[PDB]
Amino acid sequence: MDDELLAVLGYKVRSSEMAEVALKLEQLETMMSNVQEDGLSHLATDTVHYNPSELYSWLDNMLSELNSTRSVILVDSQENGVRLVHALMACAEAIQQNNLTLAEALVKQIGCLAVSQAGAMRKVATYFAEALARRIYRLSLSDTLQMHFYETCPYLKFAHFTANQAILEAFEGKKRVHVIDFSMNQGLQWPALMQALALREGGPPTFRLTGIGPPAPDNSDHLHEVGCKLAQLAEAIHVEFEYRGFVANSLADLDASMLELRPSDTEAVAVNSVFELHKLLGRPGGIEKVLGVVKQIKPVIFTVVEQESNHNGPVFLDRFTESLHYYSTLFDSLEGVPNSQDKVMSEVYLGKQICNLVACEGPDRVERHETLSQWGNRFGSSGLAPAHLGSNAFKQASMLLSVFNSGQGYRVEESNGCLMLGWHTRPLITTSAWKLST
């Protein structure tokens, strides 16, 4: 049992550990009175802090080292935006009530209204209208797009940086390591981690890499090219490198037997996933199998980056309105970027995401996003435990944002040991790390 009055304020203190905590605070003050500014500067510069909510462990660390939520943000619009939202929700309700005759007129009216608008609302309404038309008429290349999205938006860089920092912390004091990536893609994440490993105190370890990718319709061998390109830089900085890749149509088709694993006492293993787990929610029993495989691997760290939004509800209208909120926020944030080809390609990418979210159903729908609470419930049911992130990762992410965006209002937040990236006060994506439960 915690302290309810303190729990409301954001601090987790057991009722029976009150006086003890108080005592620790006493011992801190006296300490800070006899150490002056050397210890204060050490605590402000060299110390790494974890989980500020739990005061007991935080105070212990300082003493040792000194010795359904709906988040909406409104931007100024005009009457045309109000009418556009009215018409969009009216069309969604008409579809839900199985009208299918008012829906066509409503979608044409939506297009007519969106013709005379300006800003992100124009593009949002256009994409949602195409999605609605596709849905009602059903009722009755990617690599370049992802490269442009990486160039224009800060989410992929944030994910890679936070995951790499967590992996580097988990791989400290090791001589043989292995990385299993569920989101291999073009291999844009690994060179920085490899450089950091090569620039370590005590000696870099030996590196093994596993990359899993979807089956391409043309069956191109992009994984081999990525692996050889990685191996060049690997041998550049004197790191022993081994690479290996697979093609699989779903992460639920994987097993630890085909991963060619070595003894845990011999090789450490880290599992990575960036925007890939939510695609397993279409399959009725896919996430459990993948989490069981992850548990069988017995890694030292499991890094997950996801989108923070409830887009997997049982009612179509609620999903529609939640996704409308989320993507309106996304396009409002994207407003500030200067015009370029990469920007329009990112817009096309987001429009494809919206179309899949609204139109498709069943296993064909893969954009089934969730929130941190639901993901945490799933992970805890799978038998995992949180691995809290520190202040150094927070500082690195903040400095990355302050360099690559500068003017745009992106913010970093810490919650429950996880890191959140958002626009102003509205969170957008979340990075977390997990380990085996004791």
Added chain:
Amino acid sequence: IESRTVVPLNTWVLISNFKVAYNILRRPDGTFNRHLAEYLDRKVTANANPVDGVFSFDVLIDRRINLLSRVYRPAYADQEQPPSILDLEKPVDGDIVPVILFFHGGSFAHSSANSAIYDTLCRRLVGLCKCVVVSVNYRRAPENPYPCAYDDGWIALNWVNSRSWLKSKKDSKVHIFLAGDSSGGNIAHNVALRAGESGIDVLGNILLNPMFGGNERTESEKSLDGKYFVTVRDRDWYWKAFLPEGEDREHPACNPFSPRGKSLEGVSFPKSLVVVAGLDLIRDWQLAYAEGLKKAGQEVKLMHLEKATVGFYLLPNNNHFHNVMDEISAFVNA
């Protein structure tokens, strides 16, 4: 051990934790550690679903300066479905509806509008005064020194006054009260001055432990130094971090009744409610501010709690909190 006998244990823990963290975050050369400060700060998100009869949402008031505010409203009795867009800014139903523009404390350098200690306070204000609350997110020192916060408050005041769905049905006007905590009281006083200078009409001021100072050392500063969570050293550091370069504490932004300050005699000023804690080391400056308001010919009610410390309103476990809430409710619903 002296401060241990005047507060409950959990309140003591909260204030001591804030004290030690802020001790860590300050550098001798007038430099702040913003990254660690933001990492340590506890925060909460806006929720459009009514919880305990209150729901909130955020509005981007200004884009050039990234000025933002949060709005707290009572839950709809007629509409059982939780509010959404097209329903967050629905017109108010009531002959008289007061609206409070609130400024948070932090000695011009800490905290935000989404901090978990001020979100609870705003929700309690909504629940106890039956009003609408707008909380501003103003720029902080030393990265954004004087006068950024005053300009932010002015812009927020204009935005609140220009809203058509906040107008009352008795005179087609917005009933506005300015409220402040710590440095928020300083901001509220200055914004009230500017509003009186312009054509905007403010109905009342609420100042909970306002932040004021001066060059001289008062008796309470010399007698209560370091005994009740606050020391003269950090007060000097914060005043140096806020004020312009090469400026002393007789600046009008520090001492409202300095010789360089402006006379309040014969000036359109709202009625004030100033609350002063007895166990605060800058209580003398607050009492002097109340006396100066009274001498200038303005209406002011003074609440002196003789055995209260800083942050008595952050937890509802003391009589001071209940009494101050009662007086605030009577003040705004007069």
